[PDB]
Amino acid sequence: GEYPTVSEIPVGEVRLYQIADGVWSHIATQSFDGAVYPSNGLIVRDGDELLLIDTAWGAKNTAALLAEIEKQIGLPVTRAVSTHFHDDRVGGVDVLRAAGVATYASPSTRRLAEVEGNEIPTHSLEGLSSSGDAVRFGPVELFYPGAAHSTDNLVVYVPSASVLYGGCAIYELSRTSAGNVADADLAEWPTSIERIQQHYPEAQFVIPGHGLPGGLDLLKHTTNVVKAHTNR
Ligand SMILES: CCc1c(C(=O)O)c(S(N)(=O)=O)c(CC)n1C
Ligand SMILES: [Zn+2]
Ligand SMILES: [Zn+2]
Ligand SMILES: [Zn+2]
Numbered sequence: 560g561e562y563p564t565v566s567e568i569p570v571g572e573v574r575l576y577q578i579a580d581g582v583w584s585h586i587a588t589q590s591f592d593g594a595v596y597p598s599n600g601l602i603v604r605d606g607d608e609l610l611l612i613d614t615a616w617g618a619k620n621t622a623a624l625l626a627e628i629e630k631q632i633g634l635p636v637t638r639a640v641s642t643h644f645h646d647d648r649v650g651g652v653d654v655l656r657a658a659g660v661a662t663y664a665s666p667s668t669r670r671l672a673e674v675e676g677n678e679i680p681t682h683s684l685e686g687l688s689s690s691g692d693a694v695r696f697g698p699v700e701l702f703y704p705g706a707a708h709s710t711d712n713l714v715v716y717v718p719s720a721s722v723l724y725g726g727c728a729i730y731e732l733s734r735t736s737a738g739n740v741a742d743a744d745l746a747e748w749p750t751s752i753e754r755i756q757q758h759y760p761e762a763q764f765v766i767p768g769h770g771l772p773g774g775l776d777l778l779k780h781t782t783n784v785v786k787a788h789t790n791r
Contacts, residue, residue, distance in 0.1 A: 614651030621651025706744035731770030
């Protein structure tokens, strides 16, 4: 097992995993509701700077993330994008802001984070409010596939590396029942996944919000799990 598993990462530690040239995932863990879960984000080299996708789920993990990036990569994180309003995506935004990172999210994500009492990224990403909308953000494309895991969920594509960061709209294969669906749109989630398939059919690596990467098979896997949950 080369990809770090929830079992191998102690409290408040962060692993990096090089997926491709100038693309890493970051992996952290927290206790939640009596179980330990892993959580993924992304790091994309942006010349001699780094673009961060998502916090490492809380302030302590996010401080450890910045220290791991300095140790293993040693280039400054200048911008971060949060892919939805939940604490595994925005928890630690204030740590990033204090370290001089420009934090970004859609106005949808910023609105929902403020309602929830979660940390609010400073900068707004325009042009992502309609299903199927894509915008460039330096070395990535940001895509709003429609409501799925959350109404605001974004996916991130790294064209140089054919890496699709699905975030929490995409489940790892080992997840065969629904995760947190309190904020989900079950009715639209499969339609939103099909938009991802149609936009990024060339993707070679697919990174879920939680757990092990795979290929585009994770999209069909997630549709299967969401449909089974719908039919509960
Ligand atoms: C069950 C895995 C999970 C999810 C999920 O299904 O994505 C989230 S989230 N992004 O807040 O919904 C969390 C954080 C509490 N956890 C532990
Ligand atoms: Zn979430
Ligand atoms: Zn700024
Ligand atoms: Zn999540």
